[PDB]
Amino acid sequence: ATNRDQESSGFAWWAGNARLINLSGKLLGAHVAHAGLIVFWAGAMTLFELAHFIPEKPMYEQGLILIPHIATLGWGVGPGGEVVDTFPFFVVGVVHLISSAVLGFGGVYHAIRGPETLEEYSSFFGYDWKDKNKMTTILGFHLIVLGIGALLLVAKAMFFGGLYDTWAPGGGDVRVITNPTLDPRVIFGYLLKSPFGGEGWIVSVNNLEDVVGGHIWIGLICIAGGIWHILTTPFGWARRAFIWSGEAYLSYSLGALSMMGFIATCFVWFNNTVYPSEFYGPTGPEASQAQAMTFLIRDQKLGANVGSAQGPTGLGKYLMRSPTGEIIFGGETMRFWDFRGPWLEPLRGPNGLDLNKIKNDIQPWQERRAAEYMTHAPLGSLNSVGGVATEINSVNFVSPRSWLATSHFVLAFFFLVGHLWHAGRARAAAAGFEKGIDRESEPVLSMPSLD
Amino acid sequence: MTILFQLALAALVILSFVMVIGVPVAYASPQDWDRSKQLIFLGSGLWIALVLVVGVLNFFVV
Amino acid sequence: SEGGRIPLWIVATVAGMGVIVIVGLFFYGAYAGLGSSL
Amino acid sequence: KLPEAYAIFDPLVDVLPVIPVLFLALAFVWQAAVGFR
């Protein structure tokens, strides 16, 4: 039993997996088996969701997070996001589960049966963490694989039915993307937008053309870079900048994943283009705005002049100005005037909300959507009691947006912590003092006194 | 045809359970690895087969 | 009888599962009958 | 819901998504069996 107790391995049982750092075969086992766990959860969770799925209820009334992901891709839904055929959901689930059986098989094989190290076995599949060439080669492989994935999204969008477009003229509908945005000015323009209000960095992407074109770009960049890293080895400055070890690489990827988790959190919380509100429920901003809209409609029906109604503070009760002048909804939702959504934009003019359009052009579907979104705001309790914290039990609701946002903030945070842990440890071990201070060579004792 | 589908799926689930307990115990067993390896091959091909059979018969019972 | 006959890992696994079962029952009861709000 | 044919497996489907968790727990059963060495 190579390296499988504390005395031999140096690592206690609770740091057990650290025993796999230079056992590439068994480590391959751990990784493929884990991938099997992930694919498993995808499949199983999907079949579960589907079994609990009532097609005429909104998805977000039913605790669904995966079926909304499948629907956003165009599968299973028609105009307005109505579920028109559940079979693609079924397919996605089944296939993921079946594939998880395979991955599990390979994982268990490499983990407890196959070669414990892969270097004697194959010079292709074996690796030394310190071997910068091989590392960048594997990195390259996987870059190409990712670029391929992004290109798969592109292909689904352009050649295999398209994607669900909440912004589609005449209403939300699945649409084929024929003219993806290829201009680098737009694509990377996103990357240079401020993350602050009314800007929102890449989270602000608000049309499918930009999404698809961005994924084209990302596919080419990834394949190109992957080839690049297969063909090259790290330069001098790179060599002198980094710690080159398994734990170091782990730390880097942990930092990257943290970053991505935070980004995903903001995406699912603010964006309603790649997270259509038809499937995921309204965003927070969206629902607050929707309340404003709702009571403007009610009161205007009663004969109120909503453009001239002065609220108690002196600000308009229904309508006011943004700090730069645009006409926006009043009350607290003044904070949310950056919100944009298909049900509200018909009332927007060049100077913001348009009073004439508000007086004359509000359609019943808009009233409906506003009431729906107002009454499904992403507020609810841990035991899934829908509404404000003082609401009585009756409605079983917590928005998918809350679930996704919170889960991924927690995961991103703990992954930042993980990056600090393994980065600091990587440095300490590479420099050779991760196990403590050498009593006979205590560095501070050879330093001059501070005072 | 429905009887074939139901047979194939019941067999699929059972074989799956058997493989789940069996393959790791086999891999970690000292003795009788030869016949066990034979059986893992066998059960694997039959597993794949059964999956393809349930897959096909699906569209003739749904 | 002699001490050590029943492996401690089995005692631990069985005990653990029993705990999961009783607590699972209690969480089930949060949604059913008294205290369920229904 | 699932296609009618598979309805028989409804309880199974209700239980599957939690199976990954079991693996973490299994890691401990295993460790207890080798005395956390």
Binding site: - | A28, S29, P30 | P7 | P11, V15, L26, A33
Partner: peptide
């Protein structure tokens, strides 16, 4: 509502079952 408990019993035992089988036959745990 019974088959849920039966199935989770079979799965839930499936895990520890492997460990036990291997420990009995003095396998490579």
């Amino acid at each position: 509502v019974i088959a849920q408990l039966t199935m989770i019993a079979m799965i839930g035992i499936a895990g520890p079952m492997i460990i036990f089988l291997l420990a009995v036959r003095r396998g490579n745990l």
